Amino acid sequence: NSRIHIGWMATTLDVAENLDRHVATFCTRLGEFKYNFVVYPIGGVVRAFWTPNGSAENHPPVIDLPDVQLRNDLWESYVVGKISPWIDCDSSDPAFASLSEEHLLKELSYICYLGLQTMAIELTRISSPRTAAILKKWIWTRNSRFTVWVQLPSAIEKCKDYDAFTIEHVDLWTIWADFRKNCGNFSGVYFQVALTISSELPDELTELKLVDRWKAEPLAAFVIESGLFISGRNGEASIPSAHINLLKHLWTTDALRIVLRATTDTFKYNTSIKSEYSQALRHAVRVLQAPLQPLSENLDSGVYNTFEQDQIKYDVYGEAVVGALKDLGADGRKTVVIYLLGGGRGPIGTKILKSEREYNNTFRQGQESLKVKLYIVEKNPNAIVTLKYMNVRTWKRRVTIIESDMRSLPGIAKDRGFEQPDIIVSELLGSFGDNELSPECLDGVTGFLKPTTISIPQKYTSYVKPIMSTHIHQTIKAQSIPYLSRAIPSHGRGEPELDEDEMWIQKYPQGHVRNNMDQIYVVYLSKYIPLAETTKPVFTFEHPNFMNSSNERSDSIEFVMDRNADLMGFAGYFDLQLYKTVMLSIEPSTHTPGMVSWFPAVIPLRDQLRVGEGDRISLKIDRKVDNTGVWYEWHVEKKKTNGESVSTPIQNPNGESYYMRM
Amino acid sequence: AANSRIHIGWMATTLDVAENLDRHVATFCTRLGEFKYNFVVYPIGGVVRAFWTPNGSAENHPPVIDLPDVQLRNDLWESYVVGKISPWIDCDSSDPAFASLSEEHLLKELSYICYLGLQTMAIELTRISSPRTAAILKKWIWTRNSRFTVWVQLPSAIEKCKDYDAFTIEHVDLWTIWADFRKNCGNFSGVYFQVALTISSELPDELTELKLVDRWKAEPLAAFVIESGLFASIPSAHINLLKHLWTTDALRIVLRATTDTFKYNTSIKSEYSQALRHAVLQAPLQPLSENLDSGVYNTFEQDQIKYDVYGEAVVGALKDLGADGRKTVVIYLLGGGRGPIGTKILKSEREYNNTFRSLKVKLYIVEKNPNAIVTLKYMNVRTWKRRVTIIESDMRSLPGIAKDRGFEQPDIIVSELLGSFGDNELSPECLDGVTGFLKPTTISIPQKYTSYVKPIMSTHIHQTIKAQSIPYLSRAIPSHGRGEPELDEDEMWIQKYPQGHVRNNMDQIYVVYLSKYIPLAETTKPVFTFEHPNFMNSSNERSDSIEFVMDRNADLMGFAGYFDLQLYKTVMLSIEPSTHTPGMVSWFPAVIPLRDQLRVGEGDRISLKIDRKVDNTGVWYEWHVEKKKTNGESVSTPIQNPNGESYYMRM
C-alpha cells in the first residue's frame, strides 16, 4: 500500500450532512477504506456543487470549509483543493465571466489560507484565456509555492466550446500545452497536468506516438472514473487491457498520485468496495524574514497557528484583561462592551471570555456577575470563515463577528446599532513595535469610543542597539531573485508589471543590492555582537490617541563605541504595556522568558561602517506617513573625538525599497 | 569532546623537509595520520618551491611548481591536503619587480590549488596592509566558478608585520588587519572567505581582553594556528581563549612546528594534537580556453573504451605504415592531458611488436595546460622511462618551434579535441595550426568528424534552461560569449549581459543527461563535417540547413546534438543515437535549444539553419529554424547567438 498514494475526489455523490464541518471524520473513514489523501472542494461542498441557473438574484454560497476543525499539518498532507465547478471565467456571458474571475480569486486566496500543499483546477474548455490570465498572474505573484494539478476533460467533445466543425488540429494535449503556455510556462515542479481517464480511451492515449508526449510533460495525476466492471472471480473490480497498458505505461515515478472519480451513483458495496478499487489500482502500476504585513496581506492559517503556539502572549493578554475588568468592575458594573480588533482565529477571544469567567469567580463572589458583550472586528475574509465556526462551536453564538477594516467601524457602528466600547483590545505589533501599522489601525477607531474607553495595549515603545555581524550583513546583501521569483511584488512602492513578452516582472529601478539594504528585517540574531551594552528608546505610541497626535516621528539615537569594530547596523526591539502593571517586552534586559512570539528587527546599513574606541554614533530615524502607507527613512552620523563628523547616505528615501501600505 | 569530533591538522615547515618529498606525499600524510591528526597543511608548489628564498639577481628564479597529482588519487588530495601559498610570495613587496613576480606566481599557485582540486586552502598575511595581494585574490574568487573554502592566516601580532612601524601604527590590530583584508576582497560570503588566528607564545591584548576577543564571534572564524611555543601542556590564558572562541566543533586547528628543531620523544608530536583535543545542464567544456582541473582528467580517464579504440586505431596505423618495412615511427600526441593516450600509444607499440613483428616508436606529446605538464613530467619519469619528449606549447605554434628544439616531421599525429557535438571544442583550427609542418605522408588520427542533430520535446529541459539564474556570489562569473567581467561603480566585479539574461540562457549549447523527454524524429541528420590533415587549409567556416519532418502534435524545444569521428579507416567512435559506442560516458549529448518552444503537428517541415562562423580570436554557432506547413506557409525563428554574443568559444 505505502508506495502508491490514491486520492478520493469529493463528488456530488458523497455530499452528506454538514460534511464541510466534519472533514475530520470524512478523511478518517475514507482513510479506513485504504486511500490516503483526498480532492475536496476548497470552497466547501455547499459552494462547489451550487448551480447558477436561476434568477439574477441567485448568488453563490460563501466559502465555508473551516480550518480549525483539523490541525494544519493534516490539511497540508491529506486535502487537495479543487476549484468550484460552476466557475467559468471564460463563460460566454460577460457578467458570469466577471463573477467567475472574482470568485476564482476568492477560492485561490482561500487555498492559500488553509495552507494546502496541492490544488486541482479542472479545465472545461478547449481554450481558457481568461482563466489562464487570472491564474498566471496569481502564481507568478505569490510568495507561496503550492503545486497545481490541471485536470483535463475526458475528451475534446466534452468541452463547452467544442465545435465538431472547427477542431482543425486539437486534442487533449493541445489543450494542456495551450493552457501551460498561457500561464507563462511556470515550472513543472509546480505547474502540473492531470489526465482524466474513463470508459472511452481516445486514440492519442493508445497510439504510442502520442501517449509518449505525456512523458515530456509535467504529469502529476490520473483522474480515474469509476466507469468500469467486475470481470472475474467474486466480481473483480478490474480494468481493460488498454487501460492497464496506459496506467502502466506512464507510471514512471511513484510520486504520481491517482485520484478516483465516482461517476456511477453506486453507493457501491454499501460503502465497502472503494477499497476494492484502490487495490485494483495499486496492483497495476507497482535566516532572514520580511516583517509581516497583516494589514495589506491576509495571513494564512499557518502563521496564525504558530502565533497560537506562543501561549504566553495570550496568558499575559488575559491578565491585562482581568486587570481592566478589575479597575472597571470595582465600580459595581453589570455589563461591559469589549472589542477585539483583529481577532485572527480568535485565541484572544476565547481568552477574553476565559477572563470574564475568572474575574467573576474571584471578584464577584457571592454577588452579581459582571457580563461582557464581545465584538470581534476583522478584515481577512478567510479568518472570518474561522471566526464564525469558532463563534458557533466554542463561543455559543455570544459574540458579534464584524467583517471590516476597523478603521471603518466609526461609520458602520451607529448604523448597524453597535454601542461604543469600554475596552478595545488589539495585537498589531511588529518586532519594531509600530512597524505593522498599529498606530494607524487603532487611530482609525478613535471616533467612536468614549473618553472613558481604556485601550489595550495602552503603550508600546520601539528600542534599538548597535550590532556587529559580518554574517547578518553579508547575508542581507546577497539576497537574489531566481526566475521563478521574478514577479513577486516588491516591499517598496512599486508593483509587478507586464514586460515586452507579456510576462509578469517586478522591476527594481533603485538597483537590487540597494533594494536589499533599504529594508527592515526580522532575524534570529545568530553570529552577532553587541557594540552597546544596553539599548535605547526610539518610538513611543499611546492609545487611545484621543488627541490625534501625529503618527509620524523623527529622532536621533546616539551611542558610544568602546573598541575597534565594524558596525553593520542596529537591532530593533519593542516592549508594550497592555494595561498598567501588566506588560510584555522583547528587549534584551526586560525580555519575557520563554516567549518566541517575536524575533528582533534589524535596520541594516548599506555598507559595514567602521568605528573604534571613542566615536559617537547618531542613528537618525524618521517614521514618515503617507495617504497610502508608512515607511522608515534612516541613516548614521559618526563623530570622532576631535569633533570631526561623517554621515552615511539616507537609506529608503520615500520608502522606495521598503514601504508598508494600507 | 570526543576524538573524531575535534579536528586537527599538521602544518608543514622547514622543520620537516625530507628528500624527494614533493614526490612522496602519500606516505608523508600516512605517518602524519599515524600520529593522530586527520588533515595537513602543505604548500602547493611543493617544499622545494615553498621555502625558496630570493637573494640573487634575475639569474636565479623560484622553483617550478612540482607537487604532482598522480602520486595520490584525486579524492585523497581533496580530502586531506590543504594547499598553502609559498611564504616567499609578496605581491606587496616594496620592490616593484618582486611584487610583479609575486603576482605572477601567486596566480600560478592559485591555478594549481584549482588543478589538484583541493577543498580548502590557506594564505598567510605578512603585512598590516596587503592591497595588491587583495586585488589578485579578489578578482580570483569573484571570477572563479570553483567554490572552495579559504583561510586567511593572520600574523602572530601586529608587531611582526613587514610594514610594521611603531610610529604610524595608531589604532591597528590583528582584527583591524583581518577587517581590512576582508573588506578588500569585497566581503565575499564568509561561508567561503574565512580567517585563521595564529596564537603566539605571547598572548596579545585583544585576545584576552574579553570585549575585544569577542570580535571574532562576529567574524568568519575558520581555524586556529598553533605554534609549538608551548610546553605537552598549555597555559591558563591560552586554555581560556581556545575554549572561549571555539564555538562550532566545525572549527579546525593546525599545528605549527616553530621552536622544537624536532620532538625529543618522537611521541611529542602525537602529544600536542592530543593535548589540544583536551581543549542537469552543464556548459560544453573548452580545454583550449580554460585549463582543466585535475578531476576532470581523472573522470575523463574512466572512459576506458575511448582509450581502447584509440589504441585500436594505433595498432591499425602501425600495421598500415609499419608494414612498409621500416623499424621506427614518430607520433605527435596533440593534447596529452594527463597522458593516458600516450601510455596507450606506448602500450600499442609494445603490444604491436609481438603480433605483427622491429618497429620502435618515438613519441612527441604536446600540451598547453601548464598544470598538466607537472603530471606529464612525473608521468614521463614514473612510467615512461624518459623515452618521450614532452612539449609544453600551443600545438598551433609547433611548426615554428620545430627547428629550435630539433623537432622532427611527424608520420602520425594523434589527438582528441572534440566535444559532445564534435567540433564544439575547436579541434579543426588547432590541427590546422599543426598542419604547416606535416609531411605529405602524415596520417591524422582522427581523420574526419561530422556533427549530428535530432529534434526533441521536453518541457523540463526547456524550463530548466530558461530559468537559469545568477545569485550574488556568482555575479562576476564570465560569460560564455564575447563578454568578460568588469568593475562596477563600487569597484566590484560584475559580468553584464547586455542582451538580457534569458536570451543569454537560450543562445547557448548545453550538455545534459536527457532526463524527461521525447524524440520528435526517429533518426539524426548530417550537420558539419571536417577532415584532417586539412592539407589545403580549407575554410573552417560552415553553413548548412538540416531538414526534418514532423508526425504529431508536439512542442519542439530544440535539437539534441551528437558527433561521429573516424580515427583511421575502419575503426572509429561516435556518440550518435544508433551508431553510439557502447559503455562510453565520454560525451553526453549537446542541446541546441530554441528560445520559445515551437509548436508542431503532422506534416511540418523543419529547416535547422546553422552557420559555424569563425573570427580572428574565436568561433561560434549561429542557428535558427524555418517551419513550413503542408500548405507551404513558412515562418522562421530569429537568429540565435548572433556573433557569438551569448556563446563564443575563444582561442
Ligand SMILES: Nc1ncnc2c1ncn2[C@@H]1O[C@H](CSCC[C@H](N)C(=O)O)[C@@H](O)[C@H]1O
Ligand atoms: N486594520 C485592520 N483591521 C482589521 N483587522 C486587522 C487590521 N490589521 C490587522 N488585522 C488583523 O489582526 C491580526 C494581527 S495577528 C493577531 C491575531 C491574533 N490577535 C493573535 O494574536 O493570535 C491579523 O489576523 C489581521 O487579520
Ligand SMILES: Nc1ncnc2c1ncn2[C@@H]1O[C@H](CSCC[C@H](N)C(=O)O)[C@@H](O)[C@H]1O
Ligand atoms: N592548442 C592546444 N595546444 C596544446 N594542447 C591543447 C590545445 N588545445 C587543447 N589542448 C589539450 O588537449 C586536451 C584535450 S582533452 C584530452 C585529454 C587527454 N588526452 C585525455 O583523454 O584524458 C586538453 O587537455 C588540452 O590541454
